[PDB]
């Protein structure tokens, strides 16, 4: 069916033209068991105050646009009380729910690829050098891809067909993905569990997964139609818990 | 049997409302359409299997990971032994096979292939006994030997193997020796909590070093030797498969690249020839 | 100790013997005959089970 | 002691043997396995995933995003082909760099049936019908829709469901085909032709875009591992 | 017992209408006449057997299939390694034994006999360690090494065996690795469907290559080596027996010949002497 | 570990051993066996097949079809032999190149009884009778039909059934004979003489043709494999 | 695992032991003691069974 | 003689075989799987058993 | 005798193997074990003992 509703915390999300819900690699986000845990102290578990939908900034799908990416959970640094527990606790563990919505018309056309890339290590633009943190993820805005080659000395290689990683951009469909076809679809929701090699990790020096939105089939329309087609991203943490409470840093 | 492939059940003509070919990729779903939905097929008993395509049969083949040379000369004591910070990034044929998966957990056999020669110049040997090599593994933080004939070559706790030339290659087994629960091939993050330092997997690689030397002075001439290390991962579990790499590697500590074309060119979009 | 297992032959004296000599589990031979698979996690990672003959949308 | 006799093949190093070896660090305590999601048990779980096919790889389109897109257009139509390529999933400019063809280059032999899924990424008011044909390699490649209707073909009506799976059967005389193919183990051609054509209302974009996907069925198999001819090096990477 | 021969049952005189000697070859039939039909025989218990004349006892003997030489010199990097597209047509003694049958399906053991020497000239070695050889099998389509010390000698997936000189010869087993269901020794046909291209069995031979090299530089002199490959087919089933060949072979990819006489001459048709 | 002791014969390469070896490509999936007709289980199923014997191999007849044909003629007759050759199935100019003698040259010893079948390829109105004799090697070869009637002989009447099997018995003092024979293991001679002669009606061809066949019985055996001295080479074939 | 089979001796302690050490069927020793035969396919490839004593034509 | 014992594996065909070939007890392999301990002799070498929750003095 | 095959890793000296070896002096009579107090079974019985920490290690 095409109508869904996802209620988390004090916030709901209603859609009327939905494809389905892709759920990670099969499993649902849950809490850390006693069989796998290694932190000795008691973990905190804020149910409603942390696990709720946060709406990020809006971008503009232009006719010459090529792609964007957000790195998580760094994109929700100043989003409510989820970002306040990250500063006070040394450890964190959470799953997510990534709702991406872009409605245009019956007369517009286009396509998007919404992947969630775990451990998306990204390559620099000047080889024999290294990126900096200010070039990987902005504070709330989207870092975009470039159609041509990136010339910078400390930026990500933001070419689009190599996906910023050195791999084929068509082969990104292994990861949990949907497609926003403006002919059939309106929104794309992806539920990602906690994917890491360690049971918990500090969510300041480790981007857990990267959300990429890439238009494979570009946007065209007619001059009678609208000329502003925005994309909005709404991400909710799910089953979040923390350890290691100390002073806030930073700040 | 195990683990065979599915058979094609026989099919006749049809006129149905249940069309299986028409689907929707927008849900992020790969279709389960077998050939019996779009054409008439016959009952064949497919006896093929996928034993050669499992994870354990794909990775349990030894590959070279380093090539190290060392002398037996006098002077320049850095050439009298070789060093290796343990990596799986220096030789590309095993680096690309590992980097189809994000995480990996396995045991390993490590085979050392040492092959020597006689160095040229005046005052050659003309009668030499066999050579013997000591291949010491230093876990992270141990005493590093500054040269050959050092106190750190005693190795009361470091595992060392002694090997005379002419016999079978040396081989031992190593368990899953990581700190975490999987060898992270990719690490999207930093080393310091202030988002500064070393971006990438090079901060997670803390496995130790490998040192190899001649335990014999000789006293007449020089003989170089070439240690080649071979890695065979066994008892392998793997998680989160990645796309295979497209651009060629540049560095042994980075995923840095230069942007390459997606495929090789062809003449036309409809180029069924020739 | 004699773990008699079957060899690899193609479907149209097939048994072998194996002893574990060393005291460590990492010393064993490779597990070349574990042929499980579960491709539904990447092919069908949905919340609702999708039928082929029924329409998707 | 016991009298033995060393057979040929002693003191050699075969890279793909299954032998026991003494452990370097004995009685080592390994960290416990945690349930990481996404376990790969077989490489055919990766090749069974659809991935976008660069069928428009005519330079200059391989250094852009236009390699993955198929142009379709308006008037009048149907004396033109949509696309066309040989069926060679391991050795082709089209789809050896896809997810199916990357794992195929690690092996020498392949078998089974290949799926091709086609998404229509035009507007929601655009109609159309196409013919998606596959031809066995016995004869010459087709040049029009009268020669292409005789092979295995489906007819795709674009509507509320915007995808159609053309499932290429496994028709050969051998149980396996080579990955690096030749004139002996050739598989044929895959063509696409206009059935009726695009009819758009006034105020709609006249031209659209089709995307191509490729994956394996549940009877696909590979055999005879080898190294890929895809990546190279000259010296050790520092 | 198995598999013995038939005994001759005893026979007396006879005067019958049932004549077994008179037959008709025109039906394409070889007669079943034992000696007891044309003469008086005695009861002997024949204890002979045909164990030495079976298919498995006839073909399970190793035969040489190639002789390849390679150097350890400087310059001309094609001589630093050897190549072989895998055939059973280059050495005649195994080619003729296979070509009594049309089809063949078997497993195989492959033994490598490497024998070196010292090359002449000035600046000889006078003290050399043992040599070690890498014998890589490349399945059809893999990366071909352009020379020794190449990236393709890593062999993360190609099976390679390393062998020091002085030990037993290297030996491994290979299954029935064909595409079809039998190794076709003969192929009456073409490669292209337009009846053009390569007529004969050379289009069906897609088995890969074999590369052998020295893994050691030496650094003083040159030492040539000679790889001899040996093939022993085991678990053999064979079909459609052919007449043995008469004219000597010329090419390794053809059945081309020059017309030879059917036998050797003799003096007269009635030449019972001497 | 376990104390062993290496016997003589270690690290050698015997070409005809039966040893196990580690597989180069493990867990390989082999194509299934299909029922191809004509399976050879033993080499004696090929040597038991009749094949035409070049008994007329006097040069110049070996570079033509005339080696396989035996001349018989009209008047008067019977002071002439039809043919004659020694019994040496592995080493003879006559029948070492037949189907029986080609497999015999792969072995050193042979035993058993040999069949000789004779087809009369004259006209259907021609009569005739022949004497097909075989002689043990104790004495001199026969020179006429009075010396050739004492050995093992059959009399062949040519009629509606146009073949006769002269079955040479196995008479020797040893259980086996050499293939490359000598004066010790000689087997004797095989002769053929006119009993009455050819009588043809007027209007019929006066001369005819006999063909000779040779195969093994069901008590034939070979032993001691060796290489054939039949094919040679100088260098590797390119 | 101990497949005790009989040795080769001529008709006028004859048993041997054999273990399969490796996990592949192509790794085994040769099947030197399978002595079946069927020469009727080439000697008598007829549609009708022909008797020796009865005449052919 | 076949002393079948268990290998070393981590808690989330694990048996090995061992024969003593020589006639001396010093010829054996190492006793690597004897994991007893008693740390009370150095941690709590008291005459009176001390309770944690009860005060010491 | 018995046909064997030497695997890789033969005639090497791994310092941490567990192999049997023939005794140099056979049938040796060892002195009996007396109950010496203070037996160490594990190295963690030593690390579980409190020891004074030089936290004021500023030279001088
Ligand atoms: C002289 C005795 C030498 C003993 C040999 C042991 C040294 C090797 C130990 C490290 C090997 C463990 C496997 C390492 C794999 C890579 O580090 C991971 N893929 C990266 O995390
Ligand atoms: C360095 C490791 C070398 C591994 C050796 C394996 C290479 C040999 C594989 C091919 C041999 C299979 C038997 C081939 C037989 C002939 O090709 C057929 N008679 C012709 O169809
Ligand atoms: C150290 C290993 C020595 C070889 C193992 C002992 C010889 C084989 C014994 C077979 C029966 C073992 C008991 C079961 O398992
Ligand atoms: C890897 C092979 C080691 C040798 C085989 C174990 C020793 C012989 C055991 C004999 C009894 C095996 C059970 C039956 O078969
Ligand atoms: C000198 C040691 C030779 C090897 C030991 C004999 C072979 C293994 C026998 C296994 C059964 C032994 C009886 C129990 O223990």
CATH number for the domain including A144? 2.60.120.20
- Please state the atom number of ligand 2 nearest to the C-alpha of residue E87: 17
Nearest Cα to A241, choosing from A38, A46, A77, A75?
A: A46
Side-chain half-sphere of D119: how many Cα atoms within 13 Å?
Answer: 33
Q: How many domains does chain G have?
A: 1
Map F117-154 to HEC letters: EEEECCCCCCCCEEEEEEECCCCCCCCCHHHHCCCEEE
Q: CA-to-CA distance for B184 and B102, rounded, in angstroms?
A: 6
Task: Please choose, from the candidates E126, E137, E129, the residue with its C-alpha nearest in 3D space to the C-alpha of residue E165.
Answer: E129
Q: Residue D56 in contact with residue D188, Cβ under 8 Å?
A: no
* Phi/psi of residue E112, nearest 5 degrees: -105, 125
* G and A in touch (3+ CB pairs within 8 angstroms): no
Task: Show the tokens assigned to G31.
Answer: 């099947």
**Determination technique for this entry:** cryo-EM
Domain that holds residue C57: 1-57
d(CA B136, CA B150) in angstroms, rounded, equals 13
* Residue D120: how many other CB atoms lie within 10 Å: 28
Q: Does D232 touch chain H (CB under 8 A)?
A: no
Query: B and G: touch, per 3+ CB pairs < 8 A?
Result: no
DSSP letter assigned to residue E23:
E
Sheet with F81-86, edge to edge strand ranges: F81-86, F189-194, F129-135, F152-157
**Which letter, b or e, does each residue of B94-121 get, where b requires 16 or more Cβ atoms within 10 Å of its Cβ?**
bbbbbbbbbbbbbbbbbbbbbbbbbbee
Q: What is the DSSP string of chain D?
A: -EEEEEPTTTTEEETT------BSSTT--PPPPP--S-EE-BTHHHHTS-EE------SSSTTSGGGGEEEE--SS-SSSEEEEEE--SSS-TTTSSSHHHHHHTTEEEEES-EEEEEEE-S-TT---EEEEEEE-TTSPPP-SHHHHSSSEEEEEE-SSS-EEEEEE----SSS-EESS--SSS---EEEEEESS-----TTS-S-EEEEEEEEE-TT-EEEEE---TT---SS---
- Contact (CB<8Å) D8/F9: no
Q: Give residue D29's Cα distance to chain centre.
A: 43
Residue written as tokens 């990775």? B59
Q: Are B104 and B238 in contact (CB under 8 A)?
A: yes
Exposed / middle / buried, residue E255 (Cβ in 10 Å: 0-12, 13-18, 19+): middle
Q: Go through chain D and tell me how many residues it has.
A: 238
Q: Say if CB G17 and CB I2 are below 8 A apart.
A: no
Residue that the structure tokens 């305590």 belong to? D29
Tokens (6 digits) for E175: 């299954």
Give distance in angstroms: CA of E207 to centre of ligand 2: 6
- Beta strand I2-4 with D2-6: parallel, antiparallel or unpaired? parallel
Angle of CA points A174, A175, A180, to nearest 5°: 100
**Domain segments of chain B: what residues?**
1-274
Q: What is the dihedral of CA E19, E25, E28, E29, to 10 degrees?
A: 30
Q: Give H-chain residues touching C28 at CB under 8 angstroms.
A: 7, 13
Look at residues D212, D105, D112 and name the one whose alpha carbon lies nearest to residue D165.
Answer: D212
User: Which residues fall within 8 angstroms of residue F216, CB to CB, at 6 or more apart?
Assistant: F44, F47, F48, F100, F112, F113, F114, F115
* Among D223, D141, D136, residue whose Cα is nearest residue D178: D223
Residue E65 has a CB neighbour count (10 Å cut-off) of 20
DSSP label at B145?
Answer: P
For residues E80 and E77, what is the distance between their CA atoms, to the nearest angstrom? Answer: 5
Query: For A145-174, b where at least 16 C-beta lie within 10 A, e where not — what string?
Result: bbeeebeeeebbbbbbbbbbbbbbbbbbbb
**From B87, B207, B209, mutation site for ligand 1 pocket: most ligand atoms within 8 A of C-beta:** B207
Q: Does H50 touch chain C (CB under 8 A)?
A: no
Count chain C–chain G contacts defined by CB atoms under 8 A. 35
In the three-class reduction of DSSP (H, G, I as helix; E, B as strand; rest coil), residue A148 is classed as coil
Q: Please list every residue in chain H whose beta carbon sits closer than 8 Å to the beta carbon of residue F3.
A: 21
Is-contact A120 A207, C-beta < 8 A? yes
| Bridge-based pairing state of the strands G5-6 and G15-16 | antiparallel
Report which DSSP code applies to I50. Answer: -
Q: What gap in Å lies between CA B68 and CA B74, rounded to an integer?
A: 19
- The answer to whether A and F touch (≥3 CB pairs < 8 Å) is no
Inter-chain contact B184–A119, Cβ cutoff 8 Å?
A: yes
In chain C, count H helices and then E strands.
Answer: 1, 2
Beta strand residue intervals within G1-57, DSSP E: 5-6, 15-16
Cβ–Cβ under 8 Å, residues A99 and A250: no
Asked whether B38 and B13 are in contact (CB, 8 A), the reply is: no
- Give the residue carrying structure tokens 């004549």: E19
Measured CA to CA, the distance from residue D231 to residue D224 in angstroms comes to: 19
B234: nearest CB among C30, C43, C52: C30
Query: Which secondary-structure segment (H or E) carries E59?
Result: helix E55-59
> In whole angstroms, what is the distance from residue E74 CA to residue G47 CA?
70
**Cα H17 to ligand 3 centroid, rounded to whole Å:** 5
Residue from the list F1, F3, F7 with its beta carbon closest to the beta carbon of I1: F7
Ligand 5 — pocket residues by CB below 6 A? H 1-2, 19, 21
CB B229 within 8 A of CB B239: no
Strands B132-138, D221-225: pairing is unpaired
Q: Which residues of B touch E151 (CB under 8 A)?
A: 92-93
Q: Which residues of I lie closer than 8 Å to B, measured between beta carbons?
A: 6-16
C-beta contacts of F198-201 below 8 A and 24+ residues apart = F198/F72, F198/F73, F198/F74, F198/F77, F198/F122, F198/F126, F198/F127, F198/F128, F199/F126, F199/F127, F199/F128, F200/F74, F200/F123, F200/F125, F200/F126, F200/F127, F201/F125
Domain with A94, as residue range(s), is 4-245
Structure token digits, residue I1: 């005798």
Residue E78 to residue D116: CA distance in whole angstroms? 44
* Distance of alpha carbon D125 from alpha carbon F147, whole angstroms: 109
Q: Looking at the complex, does the CB of residue F36 fall below 8 Å from at least one CB of chain D?
A: no
Q: What is the resolution of this structure in A?
A: 3.4
Cα–Cα distances in angstroms (integers) from residue G38 to residues E3, E134, E238, G42, G45, in the given order: 12, 45, 13, 9, 12
Q: Which residues are within 8 A (CB) of E208 and not within 5 positions of it... i.e. 6 or more apart? A: D108, D226, E86, E137, E138, E139, E140, E142
Q: Which residue of F has its CA nearest to H18?
A: F1
Answer whether C34 touches A (CB < 8 Å): no
Contact call for I3 and D2, based on CB within 8 A: no
Whole-number Cα distances in Å, E212 to B188, E169, E215: 42, 14, 9
For the record, the structure tokens of B260 come out as: 């390459």
- Helix/strand/coil for G40: helix
Whole-number Å distance between alpha carbons of D163 and B23:
5
E152-187 burial code (b ≥16 CB/10 A, e <16): bbbbbbbbbbbbbeebbbbbbbbbbbbbbbbbbbeb
- Rounded CA-CA distance F106/F108 in Å is 7
């Amino acid at each position: 069916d095409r109508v869904r509703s996802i209620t988390l915390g004090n916030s709901t999300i209603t859609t009327q033209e939905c494809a389905n819900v892709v759920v990670g690699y099969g499993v649902w986000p849950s809490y850390l068991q006693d069989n796998e845990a290694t932190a000795e102290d008691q973990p905190t578990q804020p149910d409603v105050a942390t696990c709720r939908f946060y709406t990020l900034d809006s971008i503009q799908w232009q006719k010459e646009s090529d792609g964007w990416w957000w790195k998580f959970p760094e994109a929700l640094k100043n989003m409510g009380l989820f970002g306040q527990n990250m500063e006070y606790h040394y450890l964190g563990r959470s799953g997510y729910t990534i709702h991406v919505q872009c409605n245009a018309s019956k007369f517009h056309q286009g396509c998007l690829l919404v992947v969630c890339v775990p451990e998306a290590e990204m390559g620099c633009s000047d080889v024999e050098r290294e990126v900096v943190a200010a070039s990987l993820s902005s504070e709330d805005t989207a870092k975009s891809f470039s159609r041509t080659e990136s010339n910078g000395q400390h930026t990500v290689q933001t070419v689009v067909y190599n996906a910023g990683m050195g791999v084929g951009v068509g082969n990104l469909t292994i990861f949990p993905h949907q497609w926003i076809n403006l002919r059939t679809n309106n929104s794309a929701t992806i539920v990602m569990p906690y994917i890491n090699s360690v049971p918990m990790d500090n969510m300041f020096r480790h981007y857990n997964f990267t959300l990429m939105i890439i238009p494979f089939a570009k946007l065209e329309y007619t001059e009678q139609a609208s000329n502003y087609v925005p994309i909005t991203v709404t991400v909710a943490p799910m089953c979040a818990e923390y350890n290691g409470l100390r002073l806030a840093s930073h700040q | 049997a195990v683990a065979r492939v599915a058979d094609t059940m026989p099919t006749g003509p049809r006129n149905t409302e249940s069309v299986p070919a028409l689907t929707a990729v927008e849900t992020g779903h790969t279709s389960q359409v077998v050939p019996g939905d779009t054409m008439q097929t016959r009952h064949v008993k497919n006896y093929h299997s996928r034993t050669e395509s499992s994870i354990e049969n794909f990775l349990c083949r030894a590959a070279c990971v380093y090539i190290a040379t060392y002398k037996s000369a006098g002077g320049t004591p850095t050439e009298r032994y070789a060093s290796w910070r343990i990596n799986t990034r220096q030789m590309v044929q095993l680096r690309r096979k590992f980097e189809l998966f994000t995480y990996l957990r396995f045991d390993m056999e490590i085979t050392f292939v040492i092959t020597s020669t006689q160095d040229p110049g005046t005052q050659l040997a003309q009668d030499m006994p066999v050579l013997t090599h000591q291949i010491m593994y230093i876990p992270p933080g141990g005493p590093v030997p500054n040269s050959a004939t050092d106190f750190a070559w005693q190795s009361s706790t470091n595992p060392s193997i002694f090997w005379t030339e002419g016999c079978a290659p040396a081989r031992m087994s190593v368990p899953f020796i990581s700190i975490g629960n999987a060898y992270s091939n990719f690490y999207d993050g930093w080393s310091h909590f202030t988002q500064e330092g070393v971006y990438g997997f090079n901060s997670l690689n803390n496995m130790g070093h490998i040192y190899v030397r001649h335990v014999n002075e000789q006293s007449l001439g020089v003989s170089t030797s070439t240690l080649r290390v071979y890695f065979k991962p066994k008892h392998v579990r793997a998680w989160v498969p990645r796309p295979p790499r497209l651009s060629p590697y540049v560095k042994s500590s980075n995923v840095n690249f230069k942007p390459t074309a997606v495929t090789t060119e062809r003449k036309d979009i409809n180029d069924v020839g020739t | 100790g004699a773990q008699v297992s079957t060899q690899k032959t193609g479907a149209h004296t097939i048994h072998y013997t194996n002893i574990n000599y060393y005291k460590d589990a990492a010393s064993n031979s490779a597990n070349r005959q574990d042929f499980t698979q579960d491709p539904s996690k990447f092919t069908e990672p949905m919340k609702d089970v999708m039928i082929k003959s029924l329409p998707a949308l | 002691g016991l009298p033995t006799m060393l057979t040929p093949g002693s003191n050699q190093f075969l890279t793909s043997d299954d032998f026991q070896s003494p452990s370097a660090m004995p009685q080592f305590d390994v960290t416990p396995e945690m349930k990481i999601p996404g376990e790969v048990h077989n490489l055919m779980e990766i090749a069974e995933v659809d991935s976008v096919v660069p069928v428009n790889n005519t330079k200059e389109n391989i250094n852009s995003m236009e390699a993955y897109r198929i142009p379709v257009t308006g008037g009048d139509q149907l004396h033109t082909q949509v696309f066309g390529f040989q069926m060679q999933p391991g050795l082709n400019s089209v789809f050896k760099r896809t997810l199916l063809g990357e794992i195929l280059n690690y092996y020498a032999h392949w078998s089974g049936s290949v799926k091709l899924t086609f998404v229509f990424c035009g507007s929601a008011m655009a109609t159309g019908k196409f013919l998606l044909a596959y031809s066995p390699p016995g004869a010459s490649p087709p040049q029009n829709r009268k020669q292409a209707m005789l092979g295995t073909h489906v007819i795709w009506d674009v509507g509320l469901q915007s995808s159609c799976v053309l499932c290429i059967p496994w028709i050969s005389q051998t149980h396996y085909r080579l990955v690096q193919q030749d004139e002996y183990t050739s598989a044929g051609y895959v063509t696409c032709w206009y059935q009726t054509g695009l009819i758009v209302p006034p105020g709609a974009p006249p031209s659209c875009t089709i995307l191509c996907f490729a994956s394996a069925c549940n009877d696909f198999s590979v055999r005879m591992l080898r190294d890929t001819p895809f990546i190279e090096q000259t010296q050790l990477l520092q």
